[PDB]
Amino acid sequence: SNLKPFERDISTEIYQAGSTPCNGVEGFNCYFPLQSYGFQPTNGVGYQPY
Amino acid sequence: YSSANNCTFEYVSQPFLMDLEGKQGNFKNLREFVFKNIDGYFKIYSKHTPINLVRDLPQGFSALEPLVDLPIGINITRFQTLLALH
Numbered sequence: 001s002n003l004k005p006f007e008r009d010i011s012t013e014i015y016q017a018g019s020t021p022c023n024g025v026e027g028f029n030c031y032f033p034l035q036s037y038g039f040q041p042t043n044g045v046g047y048q049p050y
Numbered sequence: 051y052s053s054a055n056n057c058t059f060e061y062v063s064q065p066f067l068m069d070l071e072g073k074q075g076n077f078k079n080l081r082e083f084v085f086k087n088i089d090g091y092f093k094i095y096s097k098h099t100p101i102n103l104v105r106d107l108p109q110g111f112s113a114l115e116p117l118v119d120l121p122i123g124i125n126i127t128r129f130q131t132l133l134a135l136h
């Protein structure tokens with residue numbers, strides 16, 4: 001779901017693309033909500049940290 | 051409790067002293083509260099008033115003044131009370 005203004009969503013529940021049980025597993029339709037970027041001084045303008 | 055871990059906020063008011071020892075009978079003080087959550091702000095209103103009544107709520111107009119506005123940002127769906135056992 002989306003977020004309300006100034007909501008701090010600290011949750012780490014396993015996201016499901018389709019519909020399948022997940023119990024902390026990385027699998028098809030068992031993905032993590034957490035993603036990251038690898039920022040390097042040589043990355044592009046749009047890829048730099050601000 | 052017997053712990054304190056991963057705290058993100060703490061507030062303590064000025065210490066006072068109030069009724070603690072065991073008593074049973076008609077109640078003496080009615081302390082009414084309103085608890086609401088608007089856009090992450092937890093608004094607490096309250097009014098303390100003297101009473102001489104054990105039975106149901108007294109009829110009578112009484113306004114609640116605001117006291118606290120706490121910026122917490124927590125998704126609240128359930129709550130529980132805390133009782134004192136002698």
Ligand SMILES: *[C@@H]1O[C@H](CO)[C@@H](O)[C@H](O)[C@H]1NC(C)=O
Nearest residue numbers: 010011012054055056057058
């Ligand atoms: C609480 O503190 C621990 C430190 O051991 C940390 O690993 C954890 O991510 C913190 N947050 C929660 C919600 O437990």
Ligand SMILES: *[C@@H]1O[C@H](CO)[C@@H](O)[C@H](O)[C@H]1NC(C)=O
Nearest residue numbers: 001002003004007125126127
């Ligand atoms: C708050 O938690 C409940 C789960 O108990 C969830 O259904 C609801 O969508 C959450 N609220 C927000 C704004 O994410």
